mmCIF file of C-alpha atoms in Angstrom:
data_model
loop_
_atom_site.group_PDB
_atom_site.id
_atom_site.type_symbol
_atom_site.label_atom_id
_atom_site.label_comp_id
_atom_site.label_asym_id
_atom_site.label_seq_id
_atom_site.Cartn_x
_atom_site.Cartn_y
_atom_site.Cartn_z
ATOM 1 C CA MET U 15 -23.436 -18.175 31.097
ATOM 2 C CA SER U 16 -25.427 -15.099 30.103
ATOM 3 C CA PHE U 17 -22.973 -12.340 31.055
ATOM 4 C CA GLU U 18 -19.988 -14.181 29.569
ATOM 5 C CA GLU U 19 -21.695 -14.930 26.250
ATOM 6 C CA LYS U 20 -23.061 -11.403 25.802
ATOM 7 C CA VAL U 21 -19.671 -9.723 26.285
ATOM 8 C CA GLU U 22 -17.948 -12.308 24.086
ATOM 9 C CA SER U 23 -20.540 -11.762 21.350
ATOM 10 C CA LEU U 24 -20.431 -7.959 21.454
ATOM 11 C CA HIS U 25 -16.623 -8.024 21.309
ATOM 12 C CA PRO U 26 -16.213 -9.211 17.675
ATOM 13 C CA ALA U 27 -18.964 -6.875 16.452
ATOM 14 C CA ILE U 28 -17.277 -3.858 18.050
ATOM 15 C CA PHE U 29 -13.786 -5.000 17.026
ATOM 16 C CA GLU U 30 -14.625 -5.311 13.325
ATOM 17 C CA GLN U 31 -16.115 -1.808 13.389
ATOM 18 C CA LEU U 32 -12.914 -0.353 14.867
ATOM 19 C CA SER U 33 -10.719 -2.145 12.315
ATOM 20 C CA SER U 34 -12.790 -0.829 9.401
ATOM 21 C CA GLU U 35 -11.817 2.743 10.378
ATOM 22 C CA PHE U 36 -8.084 1.941 10.069
ATOM 23 C CA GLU U 37 -7.734 1.461 6.297
ATOM 24 C CA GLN U 38 -5.470 3.748 4.263
ATOM 25 C CA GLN U 39 -3.448 3.643 1.045
ATOM 26 C CA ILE U 40 0.281 4.291 0.615
ATOM 27 C CA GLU U 41 1.782 4.512 -2.880
ATOM 28 C CA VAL U 42 5.563 4.159 -3.230
ATOM 29 C CA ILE U 43 7.318 5.091 -6.482
ATOM 30 C CA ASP U 44 10.731 3.776 -7.583
ATOM 31 C CA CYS U 45 11.816 1.846 -4.495
ATOM 32 C CA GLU U 46 13.346 -1.601 -4.005
ATOM 33 C CA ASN U 47 12.990 -2.447 -0.297
ATOM 34 C CA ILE U 48 9.672 -1.571 1.363
ATOM 35 C CA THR U 49 8.909 -2.486 4.983
ATOM 36 C CA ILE U 50 5.358 -2.214 6.337
ATOM 37 C CA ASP U 51 5.195 -2.380 10.142
ATOM 38 C CA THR U 52 1.690 -2.521 11.636
ATOM 39 C CA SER U 53 2.634 -4.179 14.930
ATOM 40 C CA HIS U 54 0.417 -3.662 18.007
ATOM 41 C CA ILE U 55 -2.300 -2.019 15.882
ATOM 42 C CA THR U 56 -4.467 -5.135 16.167
ATOM 43 C CA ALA U 57 -3.507 -5.677 19.814
ATOM 44 C CA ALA U 58 -4.363 -2.106 20.838
ATOM 45 C CA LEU U 59 -7.629 -2.200 18.882
ATOM 46 C CA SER U 60 -8.502 -5.530 20.513
ATOM 47 C CA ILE U 61 -7.948 -4.099 24.001
ATOM 48 C CA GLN U 62 -9.905 -0.919 23.261
ATOM 49 C CA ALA U 63 -12.763 -2.808 21.593
ATOM 50 C CA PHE U 64 -12.988 -5.424 24.353
ATOM 51 C CA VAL U 65 -12.895 -2.751 27.072
ATOM 52 C CA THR U 66 -15.489 -0.602 25.272
ATOM 53 C CA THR U 67 -18.092 -3.382 25.286
ATOM 54 C CA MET U 68 -17.551 -3.762 29.041
ATOM 55 C CA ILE U 69 -18.724 -0.169 29.542
ATOM 56 C CA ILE U 70 -21.908 -0.516 27.492
ATOM 57 C CA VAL U 71 -22.652 -4.003 28.849
ATOM 58 C CA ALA U 72 -22.183 -3.024 32.509
ATOM 59 C CA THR U 73 -24.834 -0.295 32.361
ATOM 60 C CA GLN U 74 -27.103 -2.451 30.185
ATOM 61 C CA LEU U 75 -27.119 -5.285 32.731
ATOM 62 C CA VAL U 76 -27.827 -3.243 35.869
ATOM 63 C CA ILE U 77 -30.200 -0.654 34.384
ATOM 64 C CA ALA U 78 -33.637 -1.746 33.189
ATOM 65 C CA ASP U 79 -35.708 0.252 30.675
ATOM 66 C CA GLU U 80 -33.651 -0.771 27.612
ATOM 67 C CA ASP U 81 -34.350 2.571 25.903
ATOM 68 C CA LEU U 82 -32.082 4.263 28.452
ATOM 69 C CA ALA U 83 -29.528 1.466 28.009
ATOM 70 C CA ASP U 84 -29.366 2.128 24.264
ATOM 71 C CA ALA U 85 -29.039 5.865 24.928
ATOM 72 C CA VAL U 86 -26.000 5.548 27.203
ATOM 73 C CA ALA U 87 -24.437 2.881 24.968
ATOM 74 C CA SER U 88 -24.755 5.108 21.898
ATOM 75 C CA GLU U 89 -23.123 8.052 23.689
ATOM 76 C CA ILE U 90 -20.084 5.897 24.499
ATOM 77 C CA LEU U 91 -19.689 4.844 20.856
ATOM 78 C CA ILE U 92 -19.665 8.435 19.577
ATOM 79 C CA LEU U 93 -17.017 9.345 22.175
ATOM 80 C CA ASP U 94 -14.424 6.985 20.691
ATOM 81 C CA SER U 95 -15.379 7.956 17.128
ATOM 82 C CA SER U 96 -13.925 11.467 17.408
ATOM 83 C CA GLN U 97 -10.563 12.705 18.754
ATOM 84 C CA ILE U 98 -8.762 9.613 17.430
ATOM 85 C CA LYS U 99 -5.928 9.974 14.908
ATOM 86 C CA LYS U 100 -3.333 7.803 13.176
ATOM 87 C CA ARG U 101 0.349 8.379 12.426
ATOM 88 C CA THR U 102 2.294 7.048 9.432
ATOM 89 C CA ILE U 103 6.009 7.353 10.215
ATOM 90 C CA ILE U 104 7.761 7.077 6.839
ATOM 91 C CA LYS U 105 11.443 6.567 7.669
ATOM 92 C CA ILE U 106 13.774 6.692 4.658
ATOM 93 C CA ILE U 107 16.772 4.650 5.792
ATOM 94 C CA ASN U 108 18.671 4.656 2.478
ATOM 95 C CA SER U 109 18.184 5.848 -1.086
ATOM 96 C CA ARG U 110 16.586 2.447 -1.792
ATOM 97 C CA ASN U 111 15.066 1.523 1.602
ATOM 98 C CA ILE U 112 11.935 3.062 3.126
ATOM 99 C CA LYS U 113 9.877 1.897 6.099
ATOM 100 C CA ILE U 114 6.190 2.721 6.535
ATOM 101 C CA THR U 115 5.267 2.371 10.211
ATOM 102 C CA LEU U 116 1.777 2.596 11.708
ATOM 103 C CA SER U 117 1.848 4.099 15.203
ATOM 104 C CA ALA U 118 -0.500 2.855 17.928
ATOM 105 C CA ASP U 119 0.389 5.697 20.312
ATOM 106 C CA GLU U 120 -2.963 7.463 19.907
ATOM 107 C CA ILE U 121 -4.831 4.198 20.501
ATOM 108 C CA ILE U 122 -2.644 3.533 23.551
ATOM 109 C CA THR U 123 -3.360 6.929 25.122
ATOM 110 C CA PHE U 124 -7.079 6.614 24.367
ATOM 111 C CA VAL U 125 -7.065 3.241 26.139
ATOM 112 C CA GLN U 126 -6.019 5.058 29.319
ATOM 113 C CA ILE U 127 -8.919 7.505 28.944
ATOM 114 C CA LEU U 128 -11.408 4.659 28.497
ATOM 115 C CA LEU U 129 -9.821 2.796 31.421
ATOM 116 C CA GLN U 130 -10.405 5.780 33.713
ATOM 117 C CA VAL U 131 -14.043 5.825 32.578
ATOM 118 C CA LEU U 132 -14.309 2.118 33.416
ATOM 119 C CA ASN U 133 -12.853 2.699 36.889
ATOM 120 C CA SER U 134 -15.108 5.709 37.508
ATOM 121 C CA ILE U 135 -18.198 3.784 36.379
ATOM 122 C CA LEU U 136 -17.361 0.850 38.661
ATOM 123 C CA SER U 137 -16.768 3.151 41.638
ATOM 124 C CA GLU U 138 -20.070 4.897 40.886
ATOM 125 C CA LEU U 139 -21.847 1.528 41.054
ATOM 126 C CA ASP G 18 -8.417 10.221 39.709
ATOM 127 C CA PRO G 19 -10.186 13.598 40.068
ATOM 128 C CA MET G 20 -9.312 14.584 36.482
ATOM 129 C CA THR G 21 -11.677 12.113 34.794
ATOM 130 C CA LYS G 22 -14.499 12.507 37.339
ATOM 131 C CA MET G 23 -16.776 15.063 35.688
ATOM 132 C CA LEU G 24 -16.809 13.681 32.126
ATOM 133 C CA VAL G 25 -18.828 10.718 33.416
ATOM 134 C CA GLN G 26 -20.860 12.589 36.057
ATOM 135 C CA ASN G 27 -22.070 15.200 33.552
ATOM 136 C CA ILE G 28 -23.558 12.632 31.158
ATOM 137 C CA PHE G 29 -25.258 10.854 34.064
ATOM 138 C CA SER G 30 -26.562 14.230 35.281
ATOM 139 C CA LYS G 31 -28.248 14.547 31.865
ATOM 140 C CA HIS G 32 -31.468 12.761 30.849
ATOM 141 C CA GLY G 33 -29.632 9.434 31.224
ATOM 142 C CA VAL G 34 -29.301 7.267 34.322
ATOM 143 C CA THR G 35 -29.882 9.160 37.573
ATOM 144 C CA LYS G 36 -28.846 8.425 41.151
ATOM 145 C CA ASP G 37 -32.250 7.053 42.170
ATOM 146 C CA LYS G 38 -32.276 4.771 39.106
ATOM 147 C CA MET G 39 -29.215 2.885 40.385
ATOM 148 C CA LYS G 40 -30.089 -0.674 41.377
ATOM 149 C CA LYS G 41 -27.118 -0.814 43.795
ATOM 150 C CA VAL G 42 -26.951 -4.586 43.349
ATOM 151 C CA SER G 43 -24.321 -6.398 45.432
ATOM 152 C CA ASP G 44 -24.219 -10.125 44.683
ATOM 153 C CA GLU G 45 -22.018 -12.777 43.063
ATOM 154 C CA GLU G 46 -21.967 -10.674 39.876
ATOM 155 C CA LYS G 47 -19.939 -7.914 41.568
ATOM 156 C CA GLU G 48 -16.889 -10.004 42.495
ATOM 157 C CA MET G 49 -16.610 -11.540 39.022
ATOM 158 C CA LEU G 50 -16.410 -7.985 37.647
ATOM 159 C CA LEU G 51 -13.686 -6.936 40.100
ATOM 160 C CA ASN G 52 -11.243 -9.672 39.079
ATOM 161 C CA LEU G 53 -11.883 -8.918 35.397
ATOM 162 C CA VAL G 54 -10.958 -5.255 35.929
ATOM 163 C CA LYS G 55 -7.708 -6.314 37.603
ATOM 164 C CA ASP G 56 -7.118 -8.577 34.600
ATOM 165 C CA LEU G 57 -7.539 -5.487 32.415
ATOM 166 C CA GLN G 58 -4.797 -3.735 34.392
ATOM 167 C CA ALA G 59 -2.344 -6.605 33.883
ATOM 168 C CA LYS G 60 -3.010 -6.887 30.143
ATOM 169 C CA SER G 61 -3.075 -3.144 29.425
ATOM 170 C CA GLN G 62 0.093 -2.488 31.438
ATOM 171 C CA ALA G 63 1.876 -5.293 29.575
ATOM 172 C CA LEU G 64 1.081 -3.448 26.345
ATOM 173 C CA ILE G 65 2.293 -0.182 27.898
ATOM 174 C CA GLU G 66 5.656 -1.625 28.955
ATOM 175 C CA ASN G 67 6.095 -3.346 25.584
ATOM 176 C CA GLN G 68 5.525 -0.038 23.787
ATOM 177 C CA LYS G 69 7.655 1.868 26.311
ATOM 178 C CA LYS G 70 10.659 -0.435 25.910
ATOM 179 C CA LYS G 71 10.281 -0.203 22.128
ATOM 180 C CA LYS G 72 10.331 3.603 22.333
ATOM 181 C CA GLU G 73 13.521 3.877 24.392
ATOM 182 C CA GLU G 74 15.201 1.115 22.374
ATOM 183 C CA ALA G 75 14.444 3.083 19.202
ATOM 184 C CA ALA G 76 16.301 5.988 20.838
ATOM 185 C CA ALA G 77 19.085 3.665 22.043
ATOM 186 C CA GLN G 78 20.833 2.415 18.895
ATOM 187 C CA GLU G 79 21.060 5.981 17.568
ATOM 188 C CA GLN G 80 22.825 7.163 20.732
ATOM 189 C CA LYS G 81 25.152 4.154 20.555
ATOM 190 C CA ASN G 82 25.809 5.036 16.902
ATOM 191 C CA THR G 83 28.663 7.517 17.299
ATOM 192 C CA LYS G 84 28.433 10.444 14.886
ATOM 193 C CA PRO G 85 31.891 11.791 13.960
ATOM 194 C CA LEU G 86 32.613 15.373 12.975
ATOM 195 C CA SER G 87 32.949 14.299 9.327
ATOM 196 C CA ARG G 88 31.211 11.301 7.744
ATOM 197 C CA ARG G 89 33.534 10.795 4.761
ATOM 198 C CA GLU G 90 36.759 9.311 6.195
ATOM 199 C CA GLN G 91 35.341 5.802 6.702
ATOM 200 C CA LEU G 92 35.898 4.932 3.012
ATOM 201 C CA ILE G 93 39.545 6.039 2.728
ATOM 202 C CA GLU G 94 41.048 2.966 4.390
ATOM 203 C CA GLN G 95 39.590 0.322 2.069
ATOM 204 C CA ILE G 96 40.293 2.183 -1.186
ATOM 205 C CA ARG G 97 44.034 2.316 -0.440
ATOM 206 C CA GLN G 98 44.151 -1.498 -0.256
ATOM 207 C CA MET E 15 12.578 -18.667 -43.469
ATOM 208 C CA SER E 16 15.496 -16.343 -42.763
ATOM 209 C CA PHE E 17 13.636 -13.202 -41.662
ATOM 210 C CA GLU E 18 11.187 -15.147 -39.488
ATOM 211 C CA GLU E 19 13.878 -17.174 -37.713
ATOM 212 C CA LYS E 20 16.133 -14.178 -37.048
ATOM 213 C CA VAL E 21 13.383 -12.115 -35.396
ATOM 214 C CA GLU E 22 12.151 -15.127 -33.420
ATOM 215 C CA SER E 23 15.693 -15.828 -32.211
ATOM 216 C CA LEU E 24 16.497 -12.238 -31.234
ATOM 217 C CA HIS E 25 13.211 -11.980 -29.322
ATOM 218 C CA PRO E 26 14.071 -14.320 -26.394
ATOM 219 C CA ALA E 27 17.566 -12.839 -26.053
ATOM 220 C CA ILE E 28 16.172 -9.305 -25.789
ATOM 221 C CA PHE E 29 13.261 -10.389 -23.577
ATOM 222 C CA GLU E 30 15.460 -12.057 -20.954
ATOM 223 C CA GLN E 31 17.605 -8.915 -20.782
ATOM 224 C CA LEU E 32 14.550 -6.731 -20.115
ATOM 225 C CA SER E 33 13.248 -9.082 -17.409
ATOM 226 C CA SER E 34 16.600 -9.079 -15.598
ATOM 227 C CA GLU E 35 16.227 -5.314 -15.004
ATOM 228 C CA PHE E 36 12.891 -5.807 -13.186
ATOM 229 C CA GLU E 37 14.037 -7.542 -9.983
ATOM 230 C CA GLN E 38 13.471 -5.905 -6.593
ATOM 231 C CA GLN E 39 13.016 -6.934 -2.961
ATOM 232 C CA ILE E 40 10.093 -6.119 -0.657
ATOM 233 C CA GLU E 41 10.291 -6.993 3.047
ATOM 234 C CA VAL E 42 7.042 -7.078 5.041
ATOM 235 C CA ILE E 43 7.091 -7.179 8.851
ATOM 236 C CA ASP E 44 4.239 -8.457 11.045
ATOM 237 C CA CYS E 45 1.525 -9.068 8.456
ATOM 238 C CA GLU E 46 -0.871 -11.959 7.854
ATOM 239 C CA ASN E 47 -2.314 -11.482 4.349
ATOM 240 C CA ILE E 48 0.115 -10.407 1.614
ATOM 241 C CA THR E 49 -0.953 -10.065 -2.028
ATOM 242 C CA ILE E 50 1.658 -9.681 -4.778
ATOM 243 C CA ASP E 51 0.174 -8.518 -8.092
ATOM 244 C CA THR E 52 2.583 -8.466 -11.047
ATOM 245 C CA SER E 53 -0.025 -8.765 -13.804
ATOM 246 C CA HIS E 54 0.760 -7.420 -17.300
ATOM 247 C CA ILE E 55 4.429 -6.897 -16.370
ATOM 248 C CA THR E 56 5.434 -9.910 -18.467
ATOM 249 C CA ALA E 57 2.940 -9.045 -21.216
ATOM 250 C CA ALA E 58 4.148 -5.443 -21.530
ATOM 251 C CA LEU E 59 7.796 -6.532 -21.466
ATOM 252 C CA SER E 60 7.056 -9.147 -24.134
ATOM 253 C CA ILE E 61 5.473 -6.538 -26.417
ATOM 254 C CA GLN E 62 8.281 -4.025 -25.879
ATOM 255 C CA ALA E 63 11.008 -6.647 -26.339
ATOM 256 C CA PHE E 64 9.407 -8.138 -29.457
ATOM 257 C CA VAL E 65 8.856 -4.686 -30.983
ATOM 258 C CA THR E 66 12.407 -3.567 -30.134
ATOM 259 C CA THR E 67 13.989 -6.405 -32.121
ATOM 260 C CA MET E 68 11.858 -5.390 -35.115
ATOM 261 C CA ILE E 69 13.566 -1.981 -35.135
ATOM 262 C CA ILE E 70 17.119 -3.332 -35.020
ATOM 263 C CA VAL E 71 16.341 -6.177 -37.440
ATOM 264 C CA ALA E 72 14.648 -3.937 -40.028
ATOM 265 C CA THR E 73 17.705 -1.703 -40.435
ATOM 266 C CA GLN E 74 20.063 -4.695 -40.261
ATOM 267 C CA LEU E 75 18.313 -6.444 -43.159
ATOM 268 C CA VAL E 76 18.132 -3.511 -45.584
ATOM 269 C CA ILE E 77 21.467 -1.850 -44.776
ATOM 270 C CA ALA E 78 24.701 -3.620 -45.696
ATOM 271 C CA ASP E 79 28.055 -2.840 -44.039
ATOM 272 C CA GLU E 80 27.278 -4.667 -40.765
ATOM 273 C CA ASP E 81 29.430 -2.221 -38.773
ATOM 274 C CA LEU E 82 26.804 0.469 -39.385
ATOM 275 C CA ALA E 83 24.061 -2.044 -38.545
ATOM 276 C CA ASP E 84 25.643 -2.724 -35.150
ATOM 277 C CA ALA E 85 26.006 1.021 -34.557
ATOM 278 C CA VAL E 86 22.321 1.819 -35.107
ATOM 279 C CA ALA E 87 21.224 -1.297 -33.200
ATOM 280 C CA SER E 88 23.333 -0.329 -30.182
ATOM 281 C CA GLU E 89 21.889 3.199 -30.126
ATOM 282 C CA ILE E 90 18.359 1.770 -29.937
ATOM 283 C CA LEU E 91 19.270 -0.449 -26.974
ATOM 284 C CA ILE E 92 20.671 2.450 -24.934
ATOM 285 C CA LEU E 93 17.498 4.465 -25.613
ATOM 286 C CA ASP E 94 15.264 1.999 -23.766
ATOM 287 C CA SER E 95 17.823 1.562 -20.971
ATOM 288 C CA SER E 96 17.305 5.072 -19.581
ATOM 289 C CA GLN E 97 14.110 7.023 -18.784
ATOM 290 C CA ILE E 98 12.320 3.853 -17.642
ATOM 291 C CA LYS E 99 10.980 3.581 -14.084
ATOM 292 C CA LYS E 100 8.894 1.203 -11.976
ATOM 293 C CA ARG E 101 6.128 1.835 -9.446
ATOM 294 C CA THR E 102 5.344 -0.265 -6.365
ATOM 295 C CA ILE E 103 1.844 0.653 -5.177
ATOM 296 C CA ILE E 104 1.648 -0.617 -1.586
ATOM 297 C CA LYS E 105 -2.045 -0.444 -0.670
ATOM 298 C CA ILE E 106 -2.798 -1.156 2.996
ATOM 299 C CA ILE E 107 -6.400 -2.370 2.925
ATOM 300 C CA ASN E 108 -6.679 -3.341 6.609
ATOM 301 C CA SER E 109 -4.473 -3.527 9.685
ATOM 302 C CA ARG E 110 -3.624 -7.098 8.613
ATOM 303 C CA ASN E 111 -3.937 -6.917 4.798
ATOM 304 C CA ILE E 112 -1.451 -5.253 2.442
ATOM 305 C CA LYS E 113 -1.178 -5.496 -1.339
ATOM 306 C CA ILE E 114 2.070 -4.934 -3.236
ATOM 307 C CA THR E 115 1.259 -4.061 -6.852
ATOM 308 C CA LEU E 116 3.745 -3.666 -9.704
ATOM 309 C CA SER E 117 2.599 -1.034 -12.203
ATOM 310 C CA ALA E 118 3.211 -1.466 -15.935
ATOM 311 C CA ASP E 119 2.144 2.104 -16.756
ATOM 312 C CA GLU E 120 5.682 3.281 -17.538
ATOM 313 C CA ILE E 121 6.260 0.267 -19.793
ATOM 314 C CA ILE E 122 2.912 0.929 -21.490
ATOM 315 C CA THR E 123 3.726 4.573 -22.244
ATOM 316 C CA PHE E 124 7.215 3.654 -23.460
ATOM 317 C CA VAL E 125 5.628 1.134 -25.838
ATOM 318 C CA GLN E 126 3.840 4.043 -27.526
ATOM 319 C CA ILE E 127 7.139 5.910 -27.937
ATOM 320 C CA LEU E 128 8.798 2.860 -29.501
ATOM 321 C CA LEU E 129 5.729 2.303 -31.696
ATOM 322 C CA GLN E 130 6.026 5.829 -33.102
ATOM 323 C CA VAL E 131 9.692 5.121 -33.865
ATOM 324 C CA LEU E 132 8.657 1.935 -35.681
ATOM 325 C CA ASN E 133 6.081 3.835 -37.749
ATOM 326 C CA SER E 134 8.541 6.637 -38.537
ATOM 327 C CA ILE E 135 11.238 4.148 -39.570
ATOM 328 C CA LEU E 136 8.828 2.296 -41.868
ATOM 329 C CA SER E 137 7.639 5.540 -43.472
ATOM 330 C CA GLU E 138 11.274 6.583 -43.944
ATOM 331 C CA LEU E 139 11.924 3.331 -45.825
ATOM 332 C CA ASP S 18 2.890 12.260 -36.007
ATOM 333 C CA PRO S 19 5.124 15.361 -36.249
ATOM 334 C CA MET S 20 6.098 15.108 -32.563
ATOM 335 C CA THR S 21 8.257 11.985 -32.928
ATOM 336 C CA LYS S 22 9.764 12.969 -36.298
ATOM 337 C CA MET S 23 13.076 14.551 -35.314
ATOM 338 C CA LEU S 24 14.246 12.013 -32.709
ATOM 339 C CA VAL S 25 14.741 9.508 -35.539
ATOM 340 C CA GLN S 26 15.882 11.979 -38.220
ATOM 341 C CA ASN S 27 18.631 13.416 -35.999
ATOM 342 C CA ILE S 28 20.294 10.040 -35.381
ATOM 343 C CA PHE S 29 20.130 9.237 -39.099
ATOM 344 C CA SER S 30 21.600 12.683 -39.840
ATOM 345 C CA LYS S 31 24.576 11.617 -37.691
ATOM 346 C CA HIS S 32 27.373 9.285 -38.843
ATOM 347 C CA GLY S 33 24.787 6.495 -39.171
ATOM 348 C CA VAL S 34 22.670 5.594 -42.190
ATOM 349 C CA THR S 35 22.293 8.440 -44.689
ATOM 350 C CA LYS S 36 19.715 9.110 -47.394
ATOM 351 C CA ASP S 37 21.928 7.859 -50.231
ATOM 352 C CA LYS S 38 22.662 4.657 -48.280
ATOM 353 C CA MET S 39 18.984 3.645 -48.401
ATOM 354 C CA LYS S 40 18.453 0.592 -50.596
ATOM 355 C CA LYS S 41 14.812 1.599 -51.251
ATOM 356 C CA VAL S 42 13.917 -2.056 -51.801
ATOM 357 C CA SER S 43 10.300 -2.759 -52.782
ATOM 358 C CA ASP S 44 9.599 -6.483 -53.097
ATOM 359 C CA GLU S 45 7.692 -9.308 -51.399
ATOM 360 C CA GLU S 46 9.495 -8.461 -48.141
ATOM 361 C CA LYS S 47 7.701 -5.100 -47.863
ATOM 362 C CA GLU S 48 4.129 -6.425 -47.749
ATOM 363 C CA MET S 49 4.950 -9.046 -45.112
ATOM 364 C CA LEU S 50 6.229 -6.197 -42.917
ATOM 365 C CA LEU S 51 3.084 -4.096 -43.403
ATOM 366 C CA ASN S 52 0.695 -6.765 -42.114
ATOM 367 C CA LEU S 53 2.975 -7.416 -39.128
ATOM 368 C CA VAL S 54 2.852 -3.727 -38.161
ATOM 369 C CA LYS S 55 -0.951 -3.811 -38.303
ATOM 370 C CA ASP S 56 -0.776 -6.915 -36.106
ATOM 371 C CA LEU S 57 1.268 -4.843 -33.650
ATOM 372 C CA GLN S 58 -1.521 -2.251 -33.541
ATOM 373 C CA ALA S 59 -4.166 -4.866 -32.713
ATOM 374 C CA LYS S 60 -2.095 -6.503 -29.967
ATOM 375 C CA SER S 61 -0.812 -3.275 -28.400
ATOM 376 C CA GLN S 62 -4.260 -1.651 -28.409
ATOM 377 C CA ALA S 63 -5.738 -4.744 -26.747
ATOM 378 C CA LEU S 64 -3.240 -4.234 -23.923
ATOM 379 C CA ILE S 65 -4.138 -0.530 -23.781
ATOM 380 C CA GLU S 66 -7.877 -1.177 -23.455
ATOM 381 C CA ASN S 67 -7.284 -3.919 -20.876
ATOM 382 C CA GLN S 68 -5.217 -1.522 -18.759
ATOM 383 C CA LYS S 69 -7.659 1.344 -19.358
ATOM 384 C CA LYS S 70 -10.691 -0.651 -18.208
ATOM 385 C CA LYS S 71 -8.727 -1.796 -15.153
ATOM 386 C CA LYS S 72 -7.914 1.826 -14.289
ATOM 387 C CA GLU S 73 -11.494 3.112 -14.428
ATOM 388 C CA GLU S 74 -12.807 -0.004 -12.673
ATOM 389 C CA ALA S 75 -10.337 0.644 -9.847
ATOM 390 C CA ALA S 76 -11.923 4.103 -9.565
ATOM 391 C CA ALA S 77 -15.435 2.632 -9.873
ATOM 392 C CA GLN S 78 -15.963 0.533 -6.734
ATOM 393 C CA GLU S 79 -14.725 3.413 -4.564
ATOM 394 C CA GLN S 80 -17.294 5.794 -6.066
ATOM 395 C CA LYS S 81 -20.002 3.155 -5.613
ATOM 396 C CA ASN S 82 -18.836 2.760 -2.001
ATOM 397 C CA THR S 83 -20.883 5.487 -0.320
ATOM 398 C CA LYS S 84 -18.952 7.346 2.375
ATOM 399 C CA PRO S 85 -21.258 8.612 5.152
ATOM 400 C CA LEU S 86 -20.591 11.674 7.274
ATOM 401 C CA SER S 87 -19.631 9.427 10.208
ATOM 402 C CA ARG S 88 -18.196 5.911 9.913
ATOM 403 C CA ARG S 89 -19.110 4.620 13.384
ATOM 404 C CA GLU S 90 -22.896 4.053 13.318
ATOM 405 C CA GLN S 91 -22.737 0.824 11.286
ATOM 406 C CA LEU S 92 -21.903 -1.226 14.414
ATOM 407 C CA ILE S 93 -24.701 0.061 16.678
ATOM 408 C CA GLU S 94 -27.468 -2.074 15.180
ATOM 409 C CA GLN S 95 -25.882 -5.492 15.731
ATOM 410 C CA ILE S 96 -24.680 -4.830 19.291
ATOM 411 C CA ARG S 97 -28.230 -4.082 20.477
ATOM 412 C CA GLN S 98 -29.355 -7.559 19.363
#
């Protein structure tokens, strides 16, 4: 069905773009045990990406004149581009054990901001 | 909530979509959106509780770990044997 | 022939000792794609081990009084034991891809130091 | 080179092998050592160039990878289709 296929096709395209902005490099010197914890990074990005396409696909469906639809959709994309950070908690447990942890707290809080936009848009319509 | 009201009204008040441009459609497409939004609440909140319980658990085993006044007497018992 | 068999017999004994000092443990949590790159670690260790036995076998052959030969040979072994490190470059390409890399740079630079000792010993003799 | 001269002379100046203890042998065993040392140069340098080309290549594909001012416009073209 048209609405289901369009949201499910825009989701992977948006998701891969979000993931590409989450690549960094950590270099560890003279260590034995290294633990890399990136849990919930993919889950939070999946939720944010799949809820972002809902915003730009809701206005696209209702509003004709596709030029306006592209304009509002583009403005949403730039909004998530800025004011998003990433933490790298490097916890040194022992003299031989370190633990690099990627924090999804900023993505989690930004999901709330986008969720309020989704609720406000739906109430507007 | 009133906090997030004007950051979506101001963009709409710009050259974008205006009030008179709203189609105001109310059909079978509206209800299928409403249940999806409620599905978003259930999934997002599940992530929130999972992160929240991880945060307080990370502050739990350190509180349970009793810190003595001096941290050098724990290795005096085994050396004597 | 005596010189050829003695160097080719001391080489595996020295090589296995060097390899035994290059064992570590890396623990990765919640990751899909893991790449372990240990290239040139065995090649650099082979060169350093096979050039180390040349030093202790050159002095052993020329110099009589085996007690002195053991003394100089032991001093060479302790030299390589210290001031040798190892790097573990952990490059996080994506949120699901990490790449543990073992660097042979320290072994490579130490090969130059041992090579200069080999040249100086040969010029001395 | 003069840099690495004294770290081998100082150990020899110790209780180890002295100048008068040198046999100073010059026979068929000397030439078979000389060609082996030159073989060491060829093999070691091959490792050096292999590592050197790997190092600059690792710094090559990142320079070729153009970094734009913003890294979020690459996913706007495909979504519109």
